[PDB]
Each structure stands twice: as C-alpha cells, then as structure tokens.
Design a protein around this ligand. Sequence first.
Ligand SMILES: Nc1ncnc2c1ncn2[C@@H]1O[C@H](COP(=O)(O)CP(=O)(O)OP(=O)(O)O)[C@@H](O)[C@H]1O
Ligand SMILES: Nc1nc2[nH]c(SCc3ccc(Cl)cc3)nc2c(=O)[nH]1
Ligand SMILES: [Mg+2]
Ligand SMILES: [Mg+2]
Ligand code: NA
Ligand code: NA
Length: 157
Amino acid sequence: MIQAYLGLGSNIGDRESQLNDAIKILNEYDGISVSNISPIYETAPVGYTEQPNFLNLCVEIQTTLTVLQLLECCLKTEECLHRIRKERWGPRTLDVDILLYGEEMIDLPKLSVPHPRMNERAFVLIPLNDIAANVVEPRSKLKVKDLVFVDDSVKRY
Ligand SMILES: Nc1ncnc2c1ncn2[C@@H]1O[C@H](COP(=O)(O)CP(=O)(O)OP(=O)(O)O)[C@@H](O)[C@H]1O
Ligand SMILES: Nc1nc2[nH]c(SCc3ccc(Cl)cc3)nc2c(=O)[nH]1
Ligand SMILES: [Mg+2]
Ligand SMILES: [Mg+2]
Ligand code: NA
Ligand code: NA
C-alpha cells in the first residue's frame, strides 16, 4: 500500500460538482482508496493567458496500483468528465495530476513524479499542506510545510 497525493483542477462547467464527481470515481477504482481531501480553493490561472479561475484541491489516496496503473485511472477519470483536448490549451472540466507517489521519483516519457511544477505552485502547495504538511517531497527533501508559501491568488472557496 502506497500513500499518494493527487492534484485536481476544474475551470469550466460546474467546477465543484465535477471535482466531487471526480473524487467519487477515483475512490471507486479497485486499488485506490481516497483517505483525505483538502479544502477547495479558487485559484488564479498560471502559466498561460487570462483564463477562467480554477477550483483546485488535493486528495490523499492509499493505493496498491503501480504509478502507471494510477496514471491510467487518473486519465480515465478525466475522460469520464468529458475533458476536451484541442490543438491549444484551454479551460478543462477536470485535470487529475499525480503529485507524489510515496517517496518515489519517476521520470518516464509519459509520467514525471513528483510533478515537475508542484514546488512552485501555490494552487498545489496550499491545499497539499492541508493534508500532507509532514510528507517529504523527495527531490527537494523538504516537507510540504517547508515548501508552502503565502499567495493571495489562492483563496478558500
Ligand atoms: N505527474 C503527472 N500526472 C499526470 N499526468 C502526467 C504527469 N506527468 C506527466 N503526465 C503526462 O502529461 C500528459 C498531459 O496531461 P495534461 O493534463 O494535459 C497536462 P496539465 O496537467 O494540463 O499541465 P501541468 O502538468 O502543468 O499541470 C498526460 O497524458 C500524462 O501522460
Ligand atoms: N490556478 C491554476 N493554474 C493552472 N495552470 C495549469 S497549467 C497551464 C494552463 C492551461 C490551461 C488553462 Cl485554461 C490555464 C492554464 N494548471 C493549473 C491549475 O490547475 N490551476
Ligand atoms: Mg495540471
Ligand atoms: Mg494534468
Ligand atoms: Na477503491
Ligand atoms: Na522525461
């Protein structure tokens, strides 16, 4: 059994309802059990143009799946929520990102864990800190509570 942490986002449709549906679907795969869920945060989009605000949260899971089996379940959940994938990035019904998989470091063409951007993202670290404050991020070797920083663009929803 491995303790893993997922980052969820939605910035189109009924964001909260899609996030709650996504959690229920994730928990329903064999080999995945949701053990904790952060508060929901409304977050300013980063890394792109002006876009609709996201709802983001993190989820703790207990899993017996390999990290690539877990990735398949995450992507399938996005498909269940009818995520659109066009030539350019745009708003999405659901994004399910693997943030941490135990203390493993995985670098494969289709998978990087810990997520390559998480340590510089308030929309990840703030909700992650609500449920994983003492979890070690194995690249930096810091606890999440030592990575998290204050960011006014992330607000409790
Ligand atoms: N830690 C991870 N979690 C989920 N997908 C990951 C991943 N690392 C790599 N990927 C790969 O990334 C591919 C594209 O996923 P997208 O969800 O479109 C990226 P995004 O989440 O919008 O950007 P972000 O990674 O900056 O958050 C997936 O098909 C998957 O194979
Ligand atoms: N707040 C926040 N910013 C994020 N940026 C990304 S990747 C680039 C990106 C892609 C499409 C759009 Cl429409 C906006 C930004 N993901 C998140 C997320 O989940 N939350
Ligand atoms: Mg993402
Ligand atoms: Mg993603
Ligand atoms: Na399950
Ligand atoms: Na790589």
